[model samples]
Target: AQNPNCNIMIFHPTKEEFNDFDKYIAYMESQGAHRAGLAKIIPPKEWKARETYDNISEILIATPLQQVASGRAGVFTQYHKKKKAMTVGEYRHLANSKKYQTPPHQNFEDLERKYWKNRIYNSPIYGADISGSLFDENTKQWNLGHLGTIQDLLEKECGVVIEGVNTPYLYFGMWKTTFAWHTEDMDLYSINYLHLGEPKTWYVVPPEHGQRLERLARELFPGSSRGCGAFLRHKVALISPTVLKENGIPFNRITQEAGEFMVTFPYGYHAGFNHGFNCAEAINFATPRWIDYGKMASQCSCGEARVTFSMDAFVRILQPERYDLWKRGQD
Candidate 1:
């Protein structure tokens, strides 16, 4: 079995054209792009939003990372490890340093320390990758506010502040820093944008094939989930496309560069790693049809492990008109 790049058509929409999130999703779904579970959008070359946040040399962040990570070859190969703290600038130097890329077996004591991959997904220390929303940096182009807006039955209609879900989450990443396969919270749609630095490569499995992936994952890490079906929520595992395909699951690869966007569909499982020092921001959004996915996910036989909000309460605000629209279905 061979894994290959996602075959969805890439769109290079102008700033104004990209504002309609609902339309974008509808168009892609109609194109049957959802079968790949992902779409790549390379916005016009004029977006310099990447340059505004590169002043990371002095910002303080933690060190030493454990839990599924990757290497220079971009494969998961790390376990529990710890290192001293440092500024973003110093960490950058180490990530791009000559010693960090050396083979693990040949690593000297100090070389191993230098090679420690310090991914910043940890939020207990200082929070936010670039402080505040990425699109809220007030891009008339990449505005973060456009999410779930065309016909929102949630925030706009119900007055709620679901940070990250509606707002945005900034993620700081370094060489080969990995985020294992997982669906967005409640299986809603997600939009991830790489603001700057080297590319990030994504592996995605469409919702239809999600079961096959889940069965293999459970077999591989029985203890990780145990009774919980959302094992990937642990954010502590990684697998290759070869593994995905050999096990009879369909997969797609999409490489996202700076100023690019990756959109994930409902229940679409996705995972990826940074090619090098980079900052990316992501947010979960919903469509009318997402109501069913949300309700069902929140009401899983396994449990409420992935639900962050009350979908039933969300249903309370859905007028018949909205209900009809949602009933139009997720293509």
Candidate 2:
């Protein structure tokens, strides 16, 4: 059941619009945090990491993901096969750096297209300390400052601050690299910012109808066992928006260009792939409204919780004013 007025909104904020984080927060909250769309924000001009580290060897040599195996780790070397874990450096070096090279006297576009077919698109490196970029002074200038408040809440309540759960991760994608169907962690809101290179094409299912799509997947792919793993396991089967539309599931598409922001609300099912080689950063955040889902989301259909933040403890540490309001039985 699609609401005529409730489709995903693509926001085009001017350079000055993001200066007020509060207004931006309110605008997103007004949408009930159950939507998925893009925000074209001005990117950092001084961020040279995307372009400067374009060399595959140098980038792999610098990161920890180069050593992770495809099966043991999350690296996607191919669509259906798992390869030994190695850095992008090792992969490129083994192929004599011709993995991306155009064959002699061949059409560049066709060669590149054939090269990416049946290959891994997203080999993301999580927990890679990105304090220099996502948390740098430049990003702090306009991005959500309250994002740090979650750390404070955890520290005050649980006496521990988990940096990995809060920090943004880097994504290195080549042509046709795909991130299959999945929702954000713990149904939390995720903001993905493209640093540079070709755009990413996305297909998003609104949060309200996410479960319906999930049921549809279960019926269609019985091998997946109808749990969250089913959604992840059916990687090669790209479910187009047309199928969803024909089945009455509301979905939309977007192309996120460099310097743009893609926001997926809690429980919004999204899948997308890169147009070509690119670099992006994604981080998760929670608002007060998320408290209701915080506990249940800790252990979803997938398995053990990636984020173990205690919502009970968080509630206990509410401000005195907020506590008083709670006592009055006002939601």
Candidate 3:
């Protein structure tokens, strides 16, 4: 129907497909992760969702607060899920408050487990991708396969690097655990691979429609822009594709299964729910084309633009050498 917001592409790889790691990298570059809309790539094997939880849950259970330091954890409660929301901290406090009582149960151990699980599941949690971190060394290590090309190669070529934005973040969610509508930080590209878990439902709005959606959102919820930080940090009211359509903005939807990769383009606004308990890993990267939009993104979010360094690095570091070669008419 010529939906501008519908820019999702899907790739399903067979077992024998791109067994050569470099071959996979080449294929991804051709797909233009930086320039394309959302992509869903299903890999060879899907790991079990709980395999991650079995190991990391202990850390979350042990030091729930410490694990989420740096404001990395986003915890929201029942009320926050369906309507105007509170900050992660506000939701966490309510969940822990005395008013939230545990019903009586005979099996104290089982009851305790269910209690914590409910608390965690009801309040979706986010933090830096801990697999590569010191959090749980035994956790299944990450293998970027084709997608690894964008990691250091892009930053190295561009000559600037920022650890936090460059590294991946892990998201753990329960049924209905959600990430509200927002674009990537600094408007850079991002790849989200579902290592294992129940499917996630994604709602994506392309940049052009997203701008209108943003304006509509501000008009509807006047306070959406008046918060502690970036416009995204503020609570977002539900704006489904149906709502977008009603407002004359078309959108796309996808249910990302386990072992699938979802790539979001620069400035694409996406929001989704974890149908059941699930875990996913996401990381951001940049391309040469991101120079201009990266600047706009930083200003929009009122945050540091990691890509600015990349742009400067290109001009001051890489371009000069190219200019010299041109001036000398070398080769």
Candidate 4:
């Protein structure tokens, strides 16, 4: 019923060690340096015809908050239906007003007008939430090259190498509440942390082998999109955080109000979801290139990534193109 390889010994950093904070970043680099895959050896799926609940469930159908989408096709549909009786500009004007429900992270409406206003003419459009991502700006022109949060701070202090595969780009560009499980093309050492919400995912499959798992997921979870990375069929059962505490396992506890969780996937097969489909809260990513790469490659080696930085800002810079998608409108 529990992950056999889910060793509680992996957790070592104490509140005392994190006092300096920057040391935490160094520690992450050291830990992530292992490049060992934990999920691979663990159970991926336990869904049997007879089984009801257990570790076998990798993909959770439970509600997740991230899937909570908003737009003309989303929660605002009621307003749009009523607004047909009103003028186009009147509705558009009102929607753009500050009172709109979409949060500060620039929703579907904000993106369309700013980036792709020329593409669509329909009143009120569909947009994505891409306010936080990597690769939205040009670091040469701006103070930050825009690799998201990590790159922002480490640009000067650390050498940064933007890999071929853009991250958080999968946010809204390809699909909503979806994922694309691909490995870092550069083969850099990475630490993967998943902050889940209403929807909690139990997946196993390394990003490198995601293509195969992706094909399998498509065959099984037919309605699932391609962006959910390389998730495979696995049972997802809800267990209280306290239960994990009883086991002395350090589960990435998100927030009580939502079904958010923090889990790290190291060179292992892993996947997750926003079970409730509600879209709130955020995920965080912290990866450091090898010390050798930092010493040899001509890029910023941000030594301060272990510290506190706005998760919001990182999501923006990680994938600006996708961020723009979340900020736009749909016909």
TM of each candidate vs. truth: 0.71, 0.63, 0.59, 0.31
Model 3 shows how many backbone clashes?
Answer: 0
| For model 1, the run of ten residues with the poorest summed lDDT | 120-129
Model 3 alpha-carbon miss at residue 35, Å: 7.2
Clashing pairs in 3: none
Task: For candidate 3, report its TM-score.
Answer: 0.59
* Top TM-score hit: 1
User: For every candidate structure, what is the RMSD over all alpha carbons to the true structure, in angstroms?
Assistant: 8.4, 8.8, 11.1, 18.3
Model with the higher TM-score, candidate 1 or 4:
1
lDDT of 2 by residue, 1-331 (tens): 2233446566655546656654675675575435442233444454322334454443442332321213211222223333445565553444233444223434434433443343333242221323224334445434422355555535554575544335556675555556656765455667777766666778787666777777766665555444445344334334545467667777777678777777776676787666555667776776655545444442232432123343223333433333343233322
Give all candidates' CA lDDT scores.
0.59, 0.51, 0.50, 0.28
Question: 1-331 in candidate 4: lDDT tens per residue?
Answer: 2332333214334435524433544453355412223211111132111222122223221212222222322101111111123222332343345533222335433432231221112232212223332222431211111223444334434454332222341121111222223222112333322222222333334323434443443543443334232222111112222333454423332111121212333333332222222322233333443222223211111221121223223333443444343233210
lDDT of 3 by residue, 1-331 (tens): 2423355667666656635534543465466532335667676564222344434433332112211111112322222322233333443343334543234455534443353344333344332234332223332323432234343644655566533223555665544455667786456677777765566778777665667767766655555455313455332444545457677765677788776778787787787666544557776666655555554552323332123223333333334433343223212
Give residue 237's lDDT in candidate 4 (0 to 100). 16
